[PDB]
Amino acid sequence: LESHMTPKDDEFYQQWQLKYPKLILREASSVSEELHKEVQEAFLTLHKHGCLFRDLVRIQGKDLLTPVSRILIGNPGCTYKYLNTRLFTVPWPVKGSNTEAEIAAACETFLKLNDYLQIETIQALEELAAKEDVEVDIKSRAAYNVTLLNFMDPQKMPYLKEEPYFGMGKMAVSWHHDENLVDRSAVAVYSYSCHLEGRDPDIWHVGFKISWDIETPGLAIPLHQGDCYFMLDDLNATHQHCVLAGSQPRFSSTHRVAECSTGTLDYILQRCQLALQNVCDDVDNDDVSLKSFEPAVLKQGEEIHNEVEFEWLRQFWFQGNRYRKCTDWWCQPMAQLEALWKKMEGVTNAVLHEVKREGLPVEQRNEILTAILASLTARQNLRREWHARCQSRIARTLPADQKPECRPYWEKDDASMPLPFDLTDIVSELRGQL
Ligand SMILES: O=C(Nc1cc(Cl)c(O)cc1O)C1(c2ccccc2)CCC1
Ligand SMILES: O=C(O)CCC(=O)C(=O)O
Ligand SMILES: [Cl-]
Ligand SMILES: [Cl-]
Ligand SMILES: [Cl-]
Ligand SMILES: [Cl-]
Ligand SMILES: [Cl-]
Ligand SMILES: [Cl-]
Ligand SMILES: [Cl-]
Ligand SMILES: [Cl-]
Ligand SMILES: [Cl-]
Ligand SMILES: [Fe+2]
C-alpha cells in the first residue's frame, strides 16, 4: 500500500523531529497581518497586469508547456535557470536605482518579504547551529538574491498527475530539487492559497521525501494562506519535494540564493569585452581585423560567441511573452548584447577568411581549425535546436502576443550580416580540410 504522513498521524511528529529537522514551518499567525495584506495584493497586482507566464520549456528532448505560470523578481542584472530556461529578473529596488508604478511597488514588496524571510532564515540557521565565519556561511546561505513567484489554478487543468509513491493525490509539481542554487543555501517559501483517510484533497501541501527512498513514508505538510516553510542547509539536496494541489488557485513566493557566477549581466558583458579584445577597435564597421590568430585566443573568442548567443540572446527572445510587460529593464542590455554578438559574427568571418588566405602554412592553418571546430560545431547544432523549438506545433499554438521569437535570425537575402545562419556548409568544409 502507498501511504504518507500528515498532521493526523501520530507518527508525523516524530518523523519530522527526527528525520526532517532542517525543515521549518512558520504558520501565517507568526507573520504580521500587515505584511500578509501587502504581499497578497502584490500577488494580485502582478496577476492582474498579466506579469506571470507559463513557459515553453524543453525537458529530455520534449517540448513542454508548464502548467504553472511564473515570474522572476530579484537583483538587477541577475538571472536564474529553471527547467533549462534562463529566467531574467524583474529588478526589485535594491540600493542603486532604475516600472508602471504598480508593478514597481509590487517588486518593492517582494524585496520587503525577502528582507523578512532572510532574517527569519538566519534566525533558524543560528538556532540549528546552536543545537549541538560559520556566521559568514550562515548569512551567505540566507542572502536571497531572487524570488520565483508561481501561480496555478488547478481548475484550469483537465487532469493532474497522481503522486506515484505515497498516495498523496494530485500534484501541481512533481518530486524534484530546487536547482542551480549556492551550495547548502536555504530556500524560503511564502504560500498564498485561497472521517479522513489521508491528506486533505482540497488543501495545498508541500510533500517531502528522502532522495532514492520510497520506503520511508513521505511527509505531506498542509499549507494554509500565509504559511511559510524553509528548507535549511543540505535539506534541498538530500530530500525531494513536490507540491500537492488543492481545490483553489494558489500563489507562492520562493526565495533562493541563485548561483550566478555565470548568470549576471555584468558577467556576460565582461565575457563580451574579453572576446572583443582580439579585435582592432578604432571604429565600429563591417571591417573586422583581429589582433591575433593564436589558437587559444580564437578558441576563447568563439566560445564566448556561443555563450552570448545561446545562453543569453536565444534564451531571452524565445521567451516570446514577458518583460516588455513587466519591465523592459533587459531592453537596452539585450540590444547591447546583440550588437556585441554582431561584432563577433564579424570575428568568425575574419577567422574563416584567414583560414582561406593563400599564404598561410598548413601547420598554423590546422592549429586554427583544431581550435575553433568544436565551437562552430555547437553553434550549428544549437542553431538547429533553437530554430526547431520556435517552429514546434506546440509553439504555433500560442496566441500572437506570446509565441517564441528566433532572434537573432536572418535570410541570405540579408547583407547586413557577414555569415549565413546555417553553417553546415562552412562547418563540413572546415572538417574536410582537417
Ligand atoms: O510540470 C510539468 N508537467 C506536469 C506536471 C504535473 Cl505534476 C502535472 O500534474 C501536470 C503536468 O503537465 C512539466 C514538467 C516538469 C518537469 C519534468 C517533466 C515535465 C511539463 C512542463 C513542466
Ligand atoms: O510553490 C512551492 O511551494 C515551491 C515552488 C514550486 O513548486 C515551483 O517551482 O513552482
Ligand atoms: Cl533534515
Ligand atoms: Cl486570483
Ligand atoms: Cl546590473
Ligand atoms: Cl549547520
Ligand atoms: Cl539581497
Ligand atoms: Cl488566490
Ligand atoms: Cl541526491
Ligand atoms: Cl541540489
Ligand atoms: Cl560594440
Ligand atoms: Fe517546487
Explained architecture:
InterPro entries: AlkB-like_sf (IPR037151), FTO (IPR032868), FTO_C (IPR024366), FTO_C_sf (IPR038413), FTO_cat_dom (IPR024367). Residues 158-169 are annotated as: Loop L1. 2-oxoglutarate binds at residues 150, 229, 250-252, 254, 256. Belongs to the fto family. Its EC number is 1.14.11.-, 1.14.11.53. The PDB classes it as oxidoreductase. This protein has 434 residues and is of the alpha+beta class. The chain has 2 domains: 4-264, Jelly Rolls (Sandwich), CATH 2.60.120.590; 265-398, Methane Monooxygenase Hydroxylase, Chain G, domain 1 (Up-down Bundle), CATH 1.20.58. 38% of the residues lie in helices and 20% in strands. It is built from 10 helices and 16 strands. The strands form 3 sheets. Strands 2, 3, 4, 7, 8, 11, 14 and 16 form an 8-stranded mixed beta sheet that branches. A 6-stranded mixed beta sheet has the order 1-13-12-15-10-9. A two-stranded antiparallel sheet has the order 5-6. A hairpin with a 2-residue loop joins strand 3 (53-59) and strand 4. Helix 6 (265-276) packs antiparallel against helix 7 (295-318) and helix 7 (295-318) packs antiparallel against helix 8. The longest helix is centred in the last third of the chain and has 30 residues, at 362-391. The chain is elongated and about 85 Å long. The N and C termini lie far apart (61 Å). The structure holds the ligand O=C(Nc1cc(Cl)c(O)cc1O)C1(c2ccccc2)CCC1, 2-oxoglutaric acid, chloride ion (9 copies) and fe (ii) ion (FE2).
